[PDB]
Each structure stands twice: as C-alpha cells, then as structure tokens.
Design a protein around this ligand. Structure first.
Ligand SMILES: Nc1ncnc2c1ncn2[C@@H]1O[C@H](COP(=O)(O)OP(=O)(O)O)[C@@H](O)[C@H]1O
Ligand SMILES: Nc1ncnc2c1ncn2[C@@H]1O[C@H](COP(=O)(O)OP(=O)(O)O)[C@@H](O)[C@H]1O
Ligand SMILES: Nc1ncnc2c1ncn2[C@@H]1O[C@H](COP(=O)(O)OP(=O)(O)O)[C@@H](O)[C@H]1O
Ligand SMILES: Nc1ncnc2c1ncn2[C@@H]1O[C@H](COP(=O)(O)OP(=O)(O)O)[C@@H](O)[C@H]1O
Ligand SMILES: [Cl-]
Ligand SMILES: [Cl-]
Ligand SMILES: [Cl-]
Lengths: 403, 403, 400, 406
C-alpha cells in the first residue's frame, strides 16, 4: 500500500521523493546532515567556481536514481521485496557517509591509513545500534554478503548509482561542458541476467557515451592540473601543521581538528581508540578552512605562506611531463624557493611537489542483453569508438611549485 | 530595423532588414517551413518536428555570433563579406525537397540537393539583381578569404553546429547535446583556416563524441532505416504503376515526377523540373500516402497504410551480409501472406547496408591554437581522444521486411 | 513498458496492454499529423509540436498524479488508474486539423469534444468494452469524481501539459509554469482536487502564466490574422465548390467542400465521421498549395498569402471598428485586386474576444486540514483581478 | 589579440571572459576571493540543498551580463568610452564586496548599524588606494555621481545586472524553475533613451515574466518560512554568544569573530576604529559555522541547544498569521519551553521569535520599467502589458511569524 513522502528539490534530477520512516530518518540524521558541510569535489572549485555541490546532494541524488532503478528492474520481471528495496535505498543514502573534509587529503596526512569506506561501515554500524537493527539488511548488501547479488551492484560496481549520480552532478555544477551522460536513461535500460546488472541493447550508445564521458571527466575535472596543484598545497599545509604541532607549536584549531594535529592517529589507533571516530564525526570543510584562514597569519613562514596561498588562490605553478621529473630540476627549484622565501632547504620541500598518476579497466566491461536473450560485452556491441582502448594508460607527470 | 524571431534552442534571432530579411521572407525559404529537418526520425522520436526553416535560421544565428567573435579577435571581415556568409548560411539547405535523399533514390534520380541549392541560389540572385553573387562565390569556395567558406561548410561549420544541437534538443537525445555557442566563442583563424582556442578543447571533445552518438542513436536508428526503405518502396511502386498508366492521386508537382522519368539530364535541361520541384514539400508526400492507402493496388496500399499507421517493417541487423536463402524465404512467405507475386514481394523485403569509417578527417580534423601560437590537431591536444581510439570500420547489414 | 522520449518531461513509460494499444491505434497515430497550435508557427517557428505529443505528455502527468494521490492515501483502483490514463490519452482525439477553423467553416456546429466521444465509443467497440470506465470518467458520470477533474477542470493534465509544452516549443519566454511540481502538491478533499499550501506560489504563477500565454501566444494578433485568412480561404472554397467549380482536394477534404455538412448530417450520416477521421494538416496544406495557382482571384490570393506568409495587416482597438473604415478598406481592396465589392469581404475581417473566471478558483489545503481559495491564500498579486475583461477589437485586412 | 583574457566556467551563463589588467586584478584580489567563502543565499540551503552558490559566482555573473550589456548598448549606437566600460565592469564586480557572512544577521546582532552598502564603499576606496586611483571612475558611477547616468542604472536599478544575475542563479541553484528569467534576452532588448535605460517592445514578454518571477522568488525562496525560522535561530545564537561573552564566559572563536563577540561594535566604532574593518574582512561563513559547531557542546544550555539545532537542522517550528501574534500565545510558549529545557523564563525568550513583514508588492523602484517602441514612443510596462497593470500588482502584505523551539 502506497507510502507517504517528503519532497526535496534537486536541480540535476528533479524532485526527490523520500518515504517517511527509516529512509527519511536517515536523511534527517546528524551523520548525514554533516554532509551538507562537505563538498563533493572541494578541490575543483578553484578551477570551476560553480562546483559548490555537497556530499549530501550526492547521497540524495544517488538515492533518487536507486528508487528509479528499483521501479525499472521490477517492471522487467526482477522481483525485489519491499525490505530489499528499503535496504538498497538506505545503503545508497549511507554509502559515502564516512567521507571527512577533503577525505583523500586526510588519508594522506593527519588521518593516515584509514579509508572512507572503512569509516562508512563504522558509522553505519553505529547508526544501526541507534536504530535497533533496522539497517542490518542494508549493511549486509553494502558488504556484498547478501545472496541476491545484483542489489549490491547497484550500490557499488560498474553501473552503480554512486557514479551515475556524481559523473552527472559534477559535470552539471562545474559547467565543464554542456554534455549529458544519460543517468536517468541508463537506469531505464537496466536489467538482471544471472544475478548481475546488464544494459538492454537499445542502450548501447548510451553506455559508450557513459564510458567515454567518464574518461573525459577524469582529465577535464578530477585530474585537472590546477586542482592537483591545489591538492599538493593542502597536503603540505597539513603536514607542516602536524610537524609544528609535534614540536609543541601552538596552532589555531577547533577541538576535532586539534585532536588529529596533536596526536598521531594511524590505522590501529583509529580502530582501537573510540575518541578518533568521535572527533572524525565532528570534522567538516569549515574546520579545515577556519584553520587555513587563521594560519595564514601564523608566524611560521612555511605554514603561513602555504595557508595564504590556499585562501587567496595563489596556486603553485604546474608543469606536466610524459617522463619523470629530473632530480636536477627539483634541486634547482627547491634552492630558488629557499632563497626567495628565506627558509631552509628542507623547509623548501613543502613548496615543490612531484606527484604521479586511472580506474579499474574492468569497470569498462559492461554486458549488453539483446531481445533474444543473447549477451555481448559492450566492446563488441559498440559502433561509436574503440571502447577497449579507453583504458590505455596515459602516463602524466606533474611538477608543482611556489610561483 | 531588425526583425526578431524566437527560437527555443538559441533564443532571439536577429535578422537585419534588407537583403537578409528579404531572403528569410522569400517563398523559396518559406517553403522550408513545410519540410522537416529529420522527417524519418519522428517515427522514433515524436518530438523531432523541427523544420529546415528553423535550422536555416539557427545556422544564421550561429553565423552572426561567429562573425562577431572572429572580428573581436582581430580578424578583418568586411560588411559585404559578413552579409555574404550570412546569406550563404540562410541558403545552404534551400535545395532540399521533402525526404530529399529518398527523392534522389526514387523519383528525382541523380540530382543532389547541393546541385539544386545552387540552381535556386542563382535563380534568387537574378531576382535580386546580383546581390547574392558574393554569397554564391563563398558557398562554392571560390573566394580568396577562405575561412569564410569554412564557416558554411567544414569541420566547424554553422550547419552542423545548428543541427547537432537542434536535433538533440527536439529528439530529446540529450547525450548528443553540444555547446554550439561555446565552440563559437573559442573560434579563431590561423593561416586562413578556422581553429579553436585550447580553452575549448573540452567543448570539442564533447562535439566529436556527440556527433558519433547522434549518428548511431538518431540518424542511423534502425527503425528510421526501416521507415526509409518503406518510403523508397512506396514511391518506386507508385512510379511503376504510373508508367503502366495507372491513375494515382497526386498534387500536380508530385504528378510531374511520377508520370515522367526525371533523371539528371532532364532535370538540368528541362526547366519544368525545377519549377515543379520547388512546389514539393512534405504535404505532397503525406497526402499521396494517405490517399494511396485506399488504392486498389495491394502493394501500394499496404505500404502506404503502413507508413501512415506506423506499422513499420521488422528490422534485423547483422555484422555479416544477409544470406540469399533468408531473403528468398521471407519474400516467399510475404508473397503468400499478402497474395502477391514473388516479384511484387520484393517491395516488402530490403537489405540496405552501411560501411562507415568512424574516423573521418573531413569531420574530425580540428586544429587547436595555444596562447603561444602553437597549433596541434585535436587528436594530439586531447589527453583522451586519439586517432587509434576513433579509427574503426563498421559494417552493418540490415534486413528489413513486412511483418 | 514501452519508453518514449519527450524533451518537455523526459521519458514516458507506456504499459503494454490497453494503454500501449491506444497509443499505437490509427486514430491516435493520426494526431502525429495535426499540430497542437498550428496557427502559432507563423509567429513562433519552433511551435511544431503535435497533438500526439500533447496526449502522451498529458498521460505522463496523469501517471505521476495517480502515484502522488495514492501516496497521500486517496484510494485508486488499478482499473480506475488505467481508465483515467486511457481517458487522457484520448481526450483530444476528436480534433481535426485546425479544428476550431473547421467548426467555423466546413464542419459546422460539431465540436471536437463531441467527435472525441464518438471516436472513443468506436474504439471501445473494437476493444470489447475495455474503454467503458474511461468513457464514463470522461463524461463525469462516475461517482469517484476527482478522477474526471484530472481529465478536465481547473487543474487538469490537459492544460498542465499544453501550457508548458506550448511555451517550451514557441520559446515565447524562458519561464516555466511548473507542471510536475504542481502535481506533487495535489490532494483530494471532499471528492475534489485541491493543492497543498506548500504549492501556493506555484499556483499563483500557474494562474498568471496562463493569462500571459493567452495574450502572448494564443491571441497573438498575427495568429488571429492568419486564422481569419484560413477561415476566408475555406469559406471561399466551399462557395466555389457549391457553384460546381473544380478544386483540388483529397477525397476526405472534397467530402466537406462539396457537401454541406452540419450538426445533424454529421451525427446521422456515418460517411461524415469516416471522412473526418482521414483529415489532417496535410489535407489542408496540400489544398492551399494547389489553390495558390487556382484561376479564382479570391481563392488563389488567399492561398498564396497562407503558403508564402503574406499575412493580413492587423490593427487593434478598444472600441469596435467603424463601418466607414470597413467600407473604405473593402473598396480599396476591391479596386487593388480587381474584384467585386462582395468578393472583397473575404479580405477584411473584424473578430472580437477570455475563459471561465471560475478556472482561477482553486482551493488550497493546509496541514491542519483547513481550506482556503487561492485568492485568499495568495501573497504575490491580485488573483481576482486576473479575470478582469480585457476588450480587444481586431481589424485584419489584405495589405497594399 | 592585444591582451590575454582569462576564461572562467559558469554553469549558469557559460564562459566568462575576464580581460587581463585591472578587471582580472579585481577578480584575483583577496577581497573578492573571500566571496568564494560566503554563500549568496546561505539561509536557503536548509530548504534547497542545491543553493550552495557563492557571492563570488554572483559577482562574476553580474560582470558577465554587464559585458554583454555594454556590447549590446554600443551596437545600438550608444557611446561608452573604454574607461566607462571598464569602470562599470569594475563597479559590478565590486558591488556586493561589503557583505560578510550572513550579512543581514550580522547587521542585526554583532556588527550592528553598519550596512554592507557602507562596507562595500569602504573596501572600494581601500582597493582604490592600493591601485593608485584606477577605481575612481567606478566608485563615481557606483555612487551615481557620474553625469552619464544610465551607467549607474546598469549597476543598481530596475534592470541592473545584480538582479538579472541573482534571479537567474538563485532559481538555477535552488531548483525553483518557476522563478527563471531570460537574463540574456532582457539584455538584448536593452537601450538608452533620455540618459535612462529602456527595453525594446519586442522584449515585453520577457519583462512580464521578469516581474512575476521576482515576486515568486520573493515568497517561495527569500521569505520561505523555514528560512525565516533558521535566520531567527542564528540571530538568537549570536546574541546569546555576545551576552555570555560580555559576562566574560569563554567561547571558541576565530580571532576575527572573537573581536565582535568580545567588543561592542556599533556604527561609530566601525567607522572610527580601523581594527573593525580589518577583522570584518577576515570573516566568512567558515568563521560562523566553526563557532556553531564547537558551541554545540558548550556548557550553556541556551547556546548549545541553539547551536546544535543549527548544525543538525532541528529548526524552530514556524507558524504564520495574517494578524499579529497574541501576547498570550507568546507567554504560554515561553513558559512551556522554559520548563521543557529547564532554563529561566528570560532565557526562554531566545527560543521564541515573532518577526514580521509589511510589504508593498508594487514598488516602482523594482517595477517601473519603460518600453520603447519602433516609432520612439515610450510606455511604462504597466501600460505596455496586456495583463500586468498597477491594480493587478498593488497589494499590501502583512505577515506575522511565530518561531519557536519544537
Ligand atoms: N580567480 C579565479 N577563480 C576561479 N577560477 C579561475 C580563476 N582564474 C582562473 N580560473 C580558472 O582556473 C584555471 C586555472 O587557472 P590558472 O592555473 O591560475 O591559470 P592558467 O590558465 O595560466 O593555468 C583556468 O583555466 C581558469 O578557467
Ligand atoms: N507509437 C509510437 N510512436 C512513437 N514512437 C514509438 C511508438 N512506439 C514505439 N516508439 C519508440 O520508437 C522506437 C522503435 O519502435 P519499434 O521499432 O516499433 O519497436 P521496437 O522497440 O521493437 O524496435 C522504440 O524504442 C520506442 O521508444
Ligand atoms: N518569416 C518569418 N517567419 C516566422 N516568424 C516571423 C517571420 N517574420 C516575422 N516573424 C515573427 O512574427 C511576428 C509577426 O510578424 P509580422 O506580423 O509579419 O510583422 P510585424 O512585426 O510588423 O507585426 C514578429 O514579431 C516576428 O517575431
Ligand atoms: N533534511 C533536509 N534537508 C534539506 N531540505 C529538507 C530536509 N527536510 C525537508 N527539506 C525541505 O525543506 C522544506 C521545509 O522543511 P521543514 O520545514 O523541516 O518541514 P515542513 O515540510 O513540515 O515545513 C520541505 O518542504 C522540504 O522540501
Ligand atoms: Cl526478502
Ligand atoms: Cl560544451
Ligand atoms: Cl524576516
């Protein structure tokens, strides 16, 4: 019998219908509300000022597409029980809950060796306790431990609701191009064969488009050189903060940020000391920006110069090469920066970065189902271009340094 | 003054009073109001109702923007040259009759729209006392400032920049949308040839992929291929019956081509051909089909009724040629099912094929200009796109037949 | 489910069975050859959308409306949902080409609503009574009365589609009337459609936009003039036909030109409906195209004006047009064209004007269950004043 | 081309071109970059999670439109010298520069009696000194003290680029497609007659939609009652934090925020003491949210309950009435909440709010737009419009809100 719903506005996909009960209670939970304070692609806003969308919007967006995908799969003779529908919807609402601000930066700096996927499971278990086991089936699906295995695939896999949301929403908000991966269309082509997700043959060119757009998104947005440079500055800022902290230097920070600056939190500490998760939960983009804003006037020349560059958008110069960067160049620039900033040679390392560089080539193996029940790999189904070659490794070296 | 015409795709289209408005209000351009841009596509995409008139105006709007942009980047264009390219683009598709390619294959054989466009341009030029002479010279690529012609016809022409966008908009195939106005903003000239500024590489990457998507998703949609084969049969049967002296309902203009054998020689040499061709639009074709659907001939009427009632030939495709034994089997089944001769059943079985190289420098070879004046082909400028990725021979063998 | 593309609302799912059988029926396929606003494309070239798209779009909106109403605990049986879905697919099926023009000229005294019912009954026979509930709802003869109101009334899916689609395709403004949102705010109170208070401004917008669509598009002076020209053309063709003059026409069109079909003849002689069914825009345009070379000066001049877009000049007044002005122009035209003074009446036209003000009386339901008329609920502007008669007087005449 | 131009992507309007030189220098200036950290409609995101756009975006967008407006006006023959073009472009880049985070809320709480308009001017003059007087003409046009007066009208007025951006952008980001306007289209119908802006009669339809869209966005978005309630909560929280601070209680705060919580800044003090501007410049939304985040665990029951409500989006219940709220209801609620939360009756005042609005829906300051015809005739839109007349639009609205802890 039809359920009552709350309605949220989403410019990308329209009206998001949220059933009252568990699902709406997830949306209103403090753990999902904190995602209104974490940008989806916060390192991209420096290139693409419109990229202000939140991880909250992504999670609702992915939910929307999940709802639609349930309806479409049932319509095609794939039975899904109401509890499975509910479970897969709660999974998708929660899938990204373990992201902190600039999550990958944190994993490389002050919250080392713990991944957002691990934190998402902890936070789901925590919430399941609070909701007295109502998320158990969601978690079981999330962990791919449920016998109906296409349901997990909707949460995590080549055709997951997560990437069908973010690839579209990130493009929509950056304004990078005016093109459109067909997220709502892709979902209407979805079916199950042998307990795995396939796409109907009428959706073939949509999948080639999808697969191509995905690679272009990486080059145009995610691996854009200005955003890589910006990321390297943030990594250096926080590693310098932790070095100063360890020396007992005083740094402005909210209590939750202070926890990770003045303690050495690593994988084992994080899982064993419950204070870590409690403090992690209290971190969002505000904690990071507030630090950078205050640090920009800190006496330390390295921390202040980095921090001021972040807030005032004085971005490192970036060069890219097809071959590694020569030790000669690095030494040269480090010296010149040492001199220009009046810092030691070792301090000048913070101002020179040489990061390397796509995703699992198997993501490109989508199976297409024909009206006569036959199945082909998209690479054979395809007419537009050579899908096999979309995954040829492109080696791209970056040189980032103070300008 | 200037006249303003609304266009949902691009907004206000501004048409200067004088020669350009005179072109727009001319009977030869007004008639394109009654010829669809993609008439065979509405059978799949009911939204695809846009006319060749809209496309002409649309390409004219884009041309006007291109002139402004090119002049703002320091490319000298005289007012007479501007006017001439504007006129050329208004007139570029003027020689299309209803279902133009179908007519070239059936009852107006061996004459292309390109030849007819030129005849009509010359005809209008006489009426307008030589005012289109420069436009015609640029149209033909016989003018020494060569980038102007490139805006009419070439990899970046205003024609495809209109149609890819317009066709996408009206079909609702948003995966083929292009940033037509964005591409124009990145347009420039280097060595009397059109180039795109490096900041527009992403726009061009989408442009090249969208063109491929629209090719297979819309223009070569198999339902549209089937429909076209049916129209080709219907008109051929009509010409066969007419040559036997059978009476067919037809407008005088259509009657002319049904009851005379018009070929290339005849078309150029007998001036009645062009006079009657000018009077053909989609209404002449659909009225014939509507009335012929009650004709006593079984072949003609069954084809005609299939057209108007949208009972379309079943269509199969194969990567290899259709077997002669399959064809004979179907032809025999259909001859029996409809009670017609084996020879007559030929009209109800068709085996068109496409052999296409997906990489074609005529559409793909676009040069990118950098801030330092260096120029790279898009295949080198693109991190993702490259000649190998795009180079792909596709062979598709269709089998279309009465169900 | 079959899936069809609609740029205005997205993908339209059509259940296999009855509903898809309606979509693919010859009677609905013919609506692909009749424009929703065919006299508008002369001003707005993008306005090429068909009655077929409108029917599918209204259907899309119906499907969403059902879901939403049931979500709020208004019970709809599956057969009722299907009924209302079928009704809205079929609601405009009785439109011929330029349907109001035909009702004023060569298919006089028969309304599209009447013809829609006949065609529904015809299809119901073919379909073994599967449309009986749909027809009963269409007639407002079913006791669950909010269902009919979805098909026809102040908040019907008909106008929620066409107000949006007509704006979309004309490109008249970049505004958006907001049709899918309005549906999400629908509820039933005392067996009638209401809107939740969260949608109040959506509704003021909707009511305002509707008026602006009337003035900007539906009553645009160039379109009025164009209508008058087509009216004259067809009346002249009927007159010539009645004198025994030969006119090019498809058999279907010939039937209405060479016989005098009125209300009683239409309902009593079954050849009428049969021929009407076979009329679409192509029959009218092919006639105009051929008539543009007809020996008759009145017919050919009118027809050539249509096909070449040489539109009557239009003036507007607040007061009726003076008889002396009319006589003056008629004389000038008779002289300029070399036709009799009576014949010159074809080239001078003075039509007058909005819709039922009760269409503006939508009820708003608040969370406490209280109900107010939108005019009291409203804060944006004076809803009551939207229906203040605007008296417009048109003078359309052949130019030169 | 003689100078390099920087191109910034905008989803709303596309490529935004910034000439190298003064204009790009303004865009890259730390005072404009800080607008990347201040939301355009920060109180709306609570209802419209898509409303994440920044004052920086709005600035760049209004500038984009201005660029097109200059081009369009000069194409209809109007004289805009390159220095006036530049000036009007710099004026619009800078027009909202004086907004701090939740600027109106600050004016009502801890930076009282100073409008963003005043602060914008102060920062414009500050930047002018930095740039050796290059912004002088721009300031002059901003102030409406330039003799070519239609230029100022492009910055501020019934057809200014400010509203032509924000109505479109706000509509785009909220997802209220009903408030969309054809900004570019309006600009294409723009001209000057008698040193004032006019709209060509072919644009009447756009101007009709423009005026209705403005009124819809006013009620649907800007005065959405959830947004009104959120704003009241934040006003309470900051007032309470200033109360506790004046009593010497210690509250977490960035230096810049601390300066306003631990000093009483008023109009006199803001203009006369230069530390006020220096610290204001350093405030953005991060300062406010980091305070609320840490205060949500503060010992004070009032502050912490308010703060946790903000961050967890447990918003005050909101009622509206056409008539004033009865003092009997107010006391009843204040008493209930005082008991429910275990705070003094005086402290429960923080949890009950009765703000109100009186609004004339017809304001010629927004609505009086002149339409020019082909024959040079001019009619006010009210006469030019078949539908939209003064009587349709003239409407006094009185709303009384009742916001309180739920
Ligand atoms: N102030 C700014 N704010 C946001 N984005 C900018 C700004 N300036 C430039 N951009 C965008 O970010 C990209 C990188 O800028 P940057 O690295 O500073 O210049 P460059 O074009 O020399 O690499 C540019 O391509 C431009 O689109
Ligand atoms: N009656 C119709 N009118 C317009 N479009 C239709 C109709 N029926 C189906 N379509 C669309 O056209 C496409 C081709 O339809 P068709 O070739 O008849 O069926 P099939 O899906 O078996 O190929 C379908 O994918 C569908 O989206
Ligand atoms: N050739 C054309 N095709 C389509 N629309 C046109 C054409 N010429 C003008 N229009 C549009 O139709 C409207 C009516 O044009 P018309 O009545 O001929 O001229 P006027 O603007 O003098 O009334 C105009 O406002 C214009 O936007
Ligand atoms: N968690 C949320 N985040 C963002 N927006 C929400 C959330 N919950 C509801 N909304 C939206 O904000 C509006 C106001 O919500 P709220 O005032 O809490 O509930 P009510 O609908 O009872 O007024 C709703 O109409 C809804 O669309
Ligand atoms: Cl189960
Ligand atoms: Cl693009
Ligand atoms: Cl208020």
């Amino acid at each position: 019998m039809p359920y009552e719903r709350k309605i949220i506005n989403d410019p990308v996909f329209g009206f998001i219908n949220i059933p009252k009960g568990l699902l709406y209670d997830i949306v209103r939970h403090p753990l999902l509300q904190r995602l209104t304070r974490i940008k989806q692609v916060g390192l991209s806003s420096v290139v693409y000022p419109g990229a202000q969308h939140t991880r909250f919007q992504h999670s609702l967006g992915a939910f929307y597409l999940m709802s639609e995908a349930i309806t479409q799969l049932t319509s095609k003779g794939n039975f899904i029980f109401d509890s499975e529908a509910e479970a897969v919807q709660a999974a998708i609402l929660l899938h990204d809950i373990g992201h902190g601000p600039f999550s990958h930066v944190l994993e490389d700096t002050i919250v080392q060796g713990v991944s957002h996927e691990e934190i998402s499971l902890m936070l789901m278990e925590r919430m399941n306790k609070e909701m007295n086991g109502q998320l158990s089936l969601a978690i079981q699906i999330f962990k791919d431990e449920y016998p109906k295995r296409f349901l997990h695939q909707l949460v995590s896999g080549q055709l997951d609701m997560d990437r069908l949301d973010y690839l579209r929403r990130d493009s929509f908000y950056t304004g990078v191009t005016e093109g459109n991966i067909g997220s709502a269309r892709i979902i209407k082509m979805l079916d199950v064969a042998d307990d795995r997700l396939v796409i109907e043959s009428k959706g073939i060119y949509s999948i080639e488009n999808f697969l191509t757009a995905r690679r272009l998104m990486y080059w145009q947005v995610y691996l854009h050189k200005t955003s890589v440079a910006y990321e390297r500055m943030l990594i250096s800022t926080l590693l310098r903060a932790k070095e100063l902290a360890s020396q007992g230097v005083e740094l402005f920070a909210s209590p939750a940020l202070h926890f990770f600056l003045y303690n050495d939190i690593n994988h084992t500490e994080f899982h064993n000391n419950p204070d870590c998760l409690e403090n992690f939960i209290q971190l969002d983009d505000n904690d990071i920006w507030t630090a950078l804003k205050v640090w920009s006037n800190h006496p330390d020349k390295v921390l202040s110069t980095l921090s001021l560059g972040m807030i005032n958008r004085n971005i490192f110069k970036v060069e890219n090469s097809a071959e590694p960067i020569g030790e000669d160049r690095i030494k040269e620039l480090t010296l010149q920066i040492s001199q220009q900033l009046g810092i030691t040679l070792s301090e000048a390392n913070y101002f020179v970065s040489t990061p390397s560089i796509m995703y699992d080539p198997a993501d490109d193996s989508i199976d297409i189902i024909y009206k006569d029940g036959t199945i082909k790999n998209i690479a054979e189904a395809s007419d537009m271009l050579n899908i096999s070659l979309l995954s040829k490794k492109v080696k791209k070296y970056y040189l980032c340094y103070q300008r």
